[PDB]
C-alpha cells in the first residue's frame, strides 16, 4: 500500500534558562527511525530503528549537520516571531515543523508536506500543489513574501518529489521485513456493571500495525456515535498499537449492541457482540 516519511521538529524557548530546546524525530509510517536532541550529549542524529543502523558514517554526518543547522535557524525564527507578534522575550514559545512525502504502492510520489506552527497554531505551509504558500495570519504573510522572493517553494518541491521519495524508497527496502509488515488487531470485549440497571461494554483492539483503525458501536444495526467513548490510539511500546471504544448500556440489553472493527490487516471488518 501507500507509505510516508515524516520529520517532526519542536523548538521551545526558555527565557532565563539558556538556548531554546530543539527536538527532532523521523518517521517512516508509524515507525520512528531517528531522533535529535539539543540537550543530549551525543549532539548527533541518533538511530532509533534497527534498519537504519546499516547506514554509513556519511549519512550520519550529513543528517547531523542538517538537523543541527535547522535547530539554529528555528532558534532565530523564534526571535523573529517575537518581533512579528510584538511579544516579550520573557515568555516561552513553541515552533513546530513537519516535513515529508507520500508514495503509493508503486513507490510513486503522491503528496508532499512542509509546514510550520507557532504556539500550537498554523503559521505557514506549502500548499498541496507545492507551488504556493498558505499564510495563517498577518505575521506569516511577511514570511510568505520572503519565501516567495527567495523561491523556497520550487526548491522544496523538487526535494519532496525527488530526494524525499528516493529516500523513502531506500528506507522501505532496508526496513523491508519490518515496514512492509501489517499486523491485524486482536479483539476482545470487556463488561462491567456501572450500577443495577446499567453496564459498560468496552471494545478492544490490540497488537495491530499500522495505527490507522476504526472502532464503531452500533445499536440495533445503527451507528451509536454521540453516546460512545473513544480513546486515542496508543503505542503498546513494542511497535504495535492499542485502542478501545465503550458504550454505557441498559442492563439486559447488551445483545442489541455491536462493535465493528476496521483495519488494513483484516480480510473483512470484524463484528463483536457480548
Amino acid at each position: 500500500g501507500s507509505h510516508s516519511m515524516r520529520y517532526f521538529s519542536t523548538s521551545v524557548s526558555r527565557p532565563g534558562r539558556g538556548e531554546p530546546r530543539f527536538i527532532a524525530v523521523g518517521y517512516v509510517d508509524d515507525t520512528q527511525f531517528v531522533r535529535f536532541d539539543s540537550d543530549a550529549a551525543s549532539q548527533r542524529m541518533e538511530p532509533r530503528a534497527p534498519w537504519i543502523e546499516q547506514e554509513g558514517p556519511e549519512y550520519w554526518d550529513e543528517e547531523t549537520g542538517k538537523v543541527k543547522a535547522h535547530s539554529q535557524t528555528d532558534r532565530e525564527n523564534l526571535r523573529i516571531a517575537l518581533r512579528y507578534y510584538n511579544q516579550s522575550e520573557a515568555g516561552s514559545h513553541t515552533l513546530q515543523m513537519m516535513f515529508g512525502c507520500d508514495v503509493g504502492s508503486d513507490g510513486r510520489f503522491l503528496r508532499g508536506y512542509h509546514q510550520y506552527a507557532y504556539d500550537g497554531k498554523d503559521y505557514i505551509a506549502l500548499k498541496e500543489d507545492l507551488r504556493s504558500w498558505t499564510a495563517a495570519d498577518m505575521a506569516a504573510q511577511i514570511t510568505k513574501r520572503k519565501w516567495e522572493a527567495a523561491h523556497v517553494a520550487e526548491q522544496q518541491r523538487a526535494y519532496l518529489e525527488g530526494t524525499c521519495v528516493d529516500g523513502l524508497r531506500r528506507y522501505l527496502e532496508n526496513g523491508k521485513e519490518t515496514l512492509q509488515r501489517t499486523d491485524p488487531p486482536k479483539t476482545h470485549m470487556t463488561h462491567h456493571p456501572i450500577s443495577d440497571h446499567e453496564a459498560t461494554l468496552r471494545c478492544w483492539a490490540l497488537g495491530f500495525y499500522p495505527a490507522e483503525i476504526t472502532l464503531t458501536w452500533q445499536r440495533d444495526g445503527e451507528d451509536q456515535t454521540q453516546d460512545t467513548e473513544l480513546v486515542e490510539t496508543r503505542p503498546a511500546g513494542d511497535g504495535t498499537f492499542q485502542k478501545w471504544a465503550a458504550v454505557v448500556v441498559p442492563s439486559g440489553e447488551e445483545q442489541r449492541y455491536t462493535c465493528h472493527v476496521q483495519h488494513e490487516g483484516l480480510p473483512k471488518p470484524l463484528t463483536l457482540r457480548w
Binding site: 520529520y7 527532532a24 523521523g26 542524529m45 550529513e62 543528517e63 542538517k66 538537523v67 543547522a69 535547522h70 535557524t73 528555528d74 532565530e76 525564527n77 523573529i80 516571531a81 512579528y84 516535513f99 512542509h114 511577511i142 514570511t143 520572503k146 519565501w147 527567495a150 523556497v152 526548491q155 522544496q156 526535494y159 530526494t163 524525499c164 529516500g167
Partner: peptide
C-alpha cells in the same frame, strides 16, 4: 533524509 532548511528564515 532531513530537509535543507537554510532558506527557512521567517
Amino acid at each position: 533524509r532531513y530537509p535543507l532548511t537554510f532558506g527557512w528564515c521567517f
